[PDB]
Amino acid sequence: MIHELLLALSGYPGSIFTWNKRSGLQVSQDFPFLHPSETSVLNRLCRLGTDYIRFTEFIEQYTGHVQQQDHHPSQQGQGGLHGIYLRAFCTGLDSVLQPYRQALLDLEQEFLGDPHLSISHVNYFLDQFQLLFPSVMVVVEQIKSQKIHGCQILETVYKHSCGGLPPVRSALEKILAVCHGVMYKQLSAWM
Amino acid sequence: ITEAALVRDILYVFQGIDGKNIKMNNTENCYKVEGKANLSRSLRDTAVRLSELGWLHNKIRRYTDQRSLDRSFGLVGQSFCAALHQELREYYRLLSVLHSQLQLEDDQGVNLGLESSLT
Amino acid sequence: IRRYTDQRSLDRSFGLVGQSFCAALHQELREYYRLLSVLHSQLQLEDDQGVNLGLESSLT
Amino acid sequence: MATPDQKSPNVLLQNLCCRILGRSEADVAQQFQYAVRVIGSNFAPTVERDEFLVAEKIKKELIRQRREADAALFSELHRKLHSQGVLKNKWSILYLLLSLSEDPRRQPSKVSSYATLFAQALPRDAHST
Amino acid sequence: LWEAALTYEASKRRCWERVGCPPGHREEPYLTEAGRDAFDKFC
Amino acid sequence: IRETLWLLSGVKKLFIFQLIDGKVTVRNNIIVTHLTHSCLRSVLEQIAAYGQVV
Amino acid sequence: AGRQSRTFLVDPNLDLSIRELVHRILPVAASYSAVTRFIEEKSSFEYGQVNHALAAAMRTLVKEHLILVSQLEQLHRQGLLSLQKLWFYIQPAMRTMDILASLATSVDKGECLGGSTLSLLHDRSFSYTGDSQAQELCLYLTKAASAPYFEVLEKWIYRGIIHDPYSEFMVEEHELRKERIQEDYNDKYWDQRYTIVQQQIPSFLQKMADKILSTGKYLNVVRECGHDVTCPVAKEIIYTLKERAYVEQIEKAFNYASKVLLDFLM
Amino acid sequence: MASSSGAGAAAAAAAANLNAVRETMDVLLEISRILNTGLDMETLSICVRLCEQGINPEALSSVIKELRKATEALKAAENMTS
């Protein structure tokens, strides 16, 4: 069951964990082998997993798809995520999700090591990402909704980088560092 | 009603989740044990004692989740929420250990009346 | 003995020396009650085991 | 190719003395004799075979050393140990380890006071051993 | 003897098809690749 | 895993992943002990898409 | 009913001997309930740090009691617990809980606060002079309870700063208008800056109270003189029953402050 | 909102399955009536389950026809002996 849960968390929805385009990742049904309270807790973790899946979908939407060659590259950034800043945003998001992927693999290995471990151990171990991911998802959704383009995206990230969540602060600092690297590269080219 | 079912309910309450036989009574703003006759009055009182802690846990977690999203709470508010989340993580770690111990006890299939049984 | 201990435990006017004497008496009484409890447990073990174990624990 | 088997106390004590003193059994004969004399008349009917008391004591000690994280790790380790069915006398092993435990703080280099409390444990003496 | 037996190392290989004894079980290669003796048996 | 590596190694005519009209398709009757049929199918579908590209 | 000990109803169809044994044992549980009530009431921050510390120590002892009860539960689960074994094992625990409950009831009846609480603790410790187990318990309680009081004392004697949220220290500060302290014939600076709280004087410190007062007065004068005084003799004050080592340390601090003040004045 | 997704989805799926089964049974009943098969709901459900379990339709049909003939012969014998 843990392997299936991780696969859903790894982006492979199954018969237990159903993905809904509208609702995101959800537990598909009541399983006879789970206590309903255990089902409730698992779905509570599945909320974080759903956010992760939606983040991965966004990553594919903005970096995984070929940029339509609309002659005016400035407007490609509006409707579709496009622009070097958009690529930097996607790269930063993937870099921030890399530690989560590593933690998920470590959890899988640990659960493989000890058959007496329960899902509660994962819920403990994964709670840090259950707190981290929602804020970054909100920031990304704001970027998408405001159609931030070019360096104006950098300004928005800076404004969001001043958040109060220390882990969110560090993650946004990493993203801002990548964006500033892109900005500095452009500035280098100009100067 | 077996004690093990009460253990499961208590683990859910520690997670703020209603058990099969213990449910949150919103009218009493407390988790209530379902009125199934087979609960000992002593067992009922013990369940109530644990359910007060579960109610407090769920209330705290609800507050943290409700306020963590409010950017207007400012940096200090976010820091308070973060500290609360860290303490909640420690609590959840302890709860996970207890749950894993109960699961191991179920998994071994042996009724070891050893002092390690979750009483 | 227990009546004496109860009679003197309530008298604050007995002073510290009196209280200490009562405390020593209570400690010895606790030892006696422990011994009595052990003997009771042995007799109870003999009754509960159903076996006429001629062990020193059988309640004769 | 060693199969676990009950070996006489003399062999175990000899190996223990050899490793503790780091000398041949001939060089620890006096110490071996003293240990043998003390050990040879000591059966613990008074020890209560209850792991929970030992675990609680270990937790309290860890808290005293400001090692709450280590206490949690110890709890998890105890859970894993219970999961494994290798040891039968866990109460004895835990009691021995706690008695032989040395405080890393005694981290630091000493421990604040030794106001031993009545808390303690059970006496088991109640049974007719 | 338990401690002499203690000095035994065991395989770290695990699988999610096995949970009761994860001491490894040697996937046992197949199609050539089991070496000369298996190839001779195949021949 | 081995069959996946062989597919990724560019082997044609795999048993689990069948090539139909130049599209790598997973055989429908495959199940693994540790995965749900739908989850395994999804993961294998992603792998198969990359294999089809290859 | 009210601030009474909890009473128990025993089924009338129970054995008379069993009923009498129960009536003999039940007092420990009544003490436990009373102690829990006291802990829950005095646990409010409003009751001051001394009462908070008392409640915390009581909580620790309650935890130990719960551990004991759990061990008895384990024995019962083994079926190894007889009523006589229970009585034997609980007798020391019964006495400990009864002593604790009597102390709690005395503190609650006296509304003891700060130095009065410390005095009550000292007197109770003398009342248990003959009970080594009770004496050890009282010593633990006194050592714990002195921590906030000795911290406040340390702050006053080493820095002349009253950080007393609950007005527990034996010295009380009155706001004297400094403008008139030089002008007004009344020693408002000398008399009102530091005042003795007679009720807050710890019985164990009563013999040194005047020296403590003078020490804190001198330190306050030095601070008001603009001389920053780092007390080199600032040490942790620990409650001790046989040795008045804290008294000697206080005397050393008084002498140091006196010397510093004298040098400042000269 | 997180915890609710498994049981709620399970309930919605069960309701949809029940409605689909009802629709299928109605279609099957209409087909049987148009073909004058003489099958009742319970017998039709049993036949459907057997076909889903892989029973050969020719064997199943022959068995059903033989059982009906046997039931008619038994009813005729019971009516002649009564």
TrEMBL record, chain E:
Cellular location(s): Cytoplasm, Cytoskeleton, Microtubule organizing center, Centrosome
Membrane-spanning ranges: none
Taxonomic superkingdom: Eukaryota
Protein family according to the UniProt entry: Belongs to the TUBGCP family.
Protein purpose: Component of the gamma-tubulin ring complex (gTuRC) which mediates microtubule nucleation. The gTuRC regulates the minus-end nucleation of alpha-beta tubulin heterodimers that grow into microtubule protafilaments, a critical step in centrosome duplication and spindle formation.
Quaternary structure and interacting proteins, as annotated: Component of the gamma-tubulin ring complex (gTuRC) consisting of TUBGCP2, TUBGCP3, TUBGCP4, TUBGCP5 and TUBGCP6 and gamma-tubulin TUBG1 or TUBG2. TUBGCP2, TUBGCP3, TUBGCP4, TUBGCP5 and TUBGCP6 assemble in a 5:5:2:1:1 stoichiometry; each is associated with a gamma-tubulin, thereby arranging 14 gamma-tubulins in a helical manner. Gamma-tubulin at the first position is blocked by TUBGCP3 at the last position, allowing 13 protafilaments to grow into a microtubule.
Protein name: Gamma-tubulin complex component 6
Shown part of the complete sequence: 282 to 324 of 1811
